[PDB]
Amino acid sequence: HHHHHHMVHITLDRNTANSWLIISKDRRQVRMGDTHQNVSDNKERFSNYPMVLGAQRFSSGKMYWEVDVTQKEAWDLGVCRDSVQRKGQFSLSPENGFWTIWLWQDSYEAGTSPQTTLHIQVPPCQIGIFVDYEAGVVSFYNITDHGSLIYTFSECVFAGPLRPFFNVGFNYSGGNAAPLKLCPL
Ligand SMILES: CCc1nnc(NC(=O)[C@H]2CCCO2)s1
Numbered sequence: 001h002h003h004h005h006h007m008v009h010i011t012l013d014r015n016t017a018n019s020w021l022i023i024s025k026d027r028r029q030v031r032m033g034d035t036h037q038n039v040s041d042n043k044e045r046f047s048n049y050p051m052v053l054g055a056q057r058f059s060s061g062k063m064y065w066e067v068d069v070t071q072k073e074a075w076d077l078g079v080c081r082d083s084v085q086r087k088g089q090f091s092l093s094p095e096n097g098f099w100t101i102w103l104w105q106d107s108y109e110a111g112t113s114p115q116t117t118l119h120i121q122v123p124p125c126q127i128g129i130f131v132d133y134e135a136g137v138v139s140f141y142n143i144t145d146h147g148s149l150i151y152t153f154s155e156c157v158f159a160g161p162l163r164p165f166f167n168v169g170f171n172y173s174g175g176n177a178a179p180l181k182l183c184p185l
Contacts, residue, residue: 001139001147003130006064007185010054010164016044016086017052021168024179027055031179032171047087054164057082063131065164066143068181069103070125074169075180076102077127078111079138081160099138099153100165101127110140110151118151126183131162143183 011027019041022033032050039045046052058079067077076092078100085096092098092111100111101118108118120142127150128141136156142148171177 001128001130001141001149003062003064003128003139003141006062006130008056008063008065009185010056010065010182012166012182013044013053013055013163014039015042016046018046018050021050021052023052028182029179030166030168032168032177044086048089050168050170051076052166052168053080054166057161057163058131058133059161060133062133065129066183067127067129067166068125068179068183069127071178072103072169072180073173073176074102074104076100076111076165076167076169077180078129078140078165079131079162080165081158082163083160094153094156097160098165099156101140101151102167108150110153112153116151120150121145122148124150129164133158133162 012023019036020033023030081097092100093113108120110116122145124142124144126143130139138153140150169176
């Protein structure tokens with residue numbers, strides 16, 4: 001792909017984080033803690049899952065960023081509406097305001113309803129995410145495999161400002177402690 005020149009500097013929004021997440025000082029890395037991280041509750045925090053939003057809001061234009069997923073067993077990545085549900089149980093779908101892919105149990109899937117199987121021969125260590133607001137497109141790229149396409153959501157109905165979306169996943173297995181990291185431009 002040739003989307004690199006739309007690169008944006010994403011930072012994580014602490015206030016949106018599930019209370020178990022640990023965000024680095026530079027707001028560019030996040031991981032699952034082994035306990036509640038001693039923050040107050042608020043209406044923005046994702047309560048049921050290890051999720052956090054980027055601080056940036058997008059309502060026009062083309063945007064690109066990269067995320068490091070090295071040695072994780074489970075994660076979700078993409079974008080979502082600013083007004084997605086924060087509390088209780090919900091599925092990641094465009095109907096609920098999410099445009100995401102994930103790794104789960106050694107398979108990759110796109111968060112359509114129902115979910116779509118992805119075909120990845122080279123397990124990615126870094127994922128590229130491209131958003132074209134005007135066109136209604138969200139695309140995912142395998143940076144480990146020379147930028148190969150993973151998935152395109154087209155005919156997207158954003159219906160609001162978008163925010164970068166992250167889920168570090170649970171660590172029930174003891175094999176999923178590694179962080180998500182925003183990669184430098
Ligand atoms: C999302 C809030 C919670 N997350 N933390 C909780 N429990 C856990 O995840 C424990 C058991 C597996 C590893 O740590 S409740």
